[PDB]
């Protein structure tokens, strides 16, 4: 029942700025990850974000900490990646993705899978 868009991709230069937006319908888990991810012309899928419902904890991949950061309106069932001082290299189909949150002793993990994707948007960073 889950379903997830990507919107805000478009071609922006080098040194740009750009949002995308992640927008969730037919969750119903209270503890939940949502990942970014993207893929780039010749290379394998990567992971860019994670963040997760129960207190918004969040982490980001080596090559994008500090220029990117993922955050939510909760109201919009909405996860938002903000991305600055864009490189050609951060060109890719990103593709946001959602995963539950699972527990044993006192504690929540994240997942290393992921089970619902959407459709990906591309962000082309080139002059």
């Known amino acids: 029942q889950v379903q997830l868009v990507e919107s805000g991709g478009g071609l922006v230069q080098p040194g740009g700025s750009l949002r995308l937006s992640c927008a969730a319908s037919?969750?119903?888990?209270?503890?939940?990850?949502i990942g970014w991810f993207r893929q780039a012309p010749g290379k394998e899928r990567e992971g860019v974000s994670r963040?997760?419902?129960?207190?918004?904890?969040?982490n980001y991949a080596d090559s994008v900490k500090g220029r990117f950061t993922m955050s939510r309106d909760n109201a919009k069932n909405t996860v938002y990646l903000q991305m600055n001082s864009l490189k050609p290299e951060d060109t890719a189909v990103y593709y946001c993705?959602?995963?539950?949150?699972?527990?044993?002793?006192?504690?929540?993990?994240?997942?290393?899978?992921?089970?619902?994707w959407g459709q990906g948007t591309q962000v082309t960073v080139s002059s």
């Open positions: 993705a959602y995963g539950p949150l699972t527990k044993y002793g006192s504690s929540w993990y994240w997942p290393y899978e992921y089970d619902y």
């Open positions: 037919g969750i119903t888990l209270d503890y939940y990850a």
């Open positions: 963040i997760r419902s129960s207190d918004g904890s969040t």
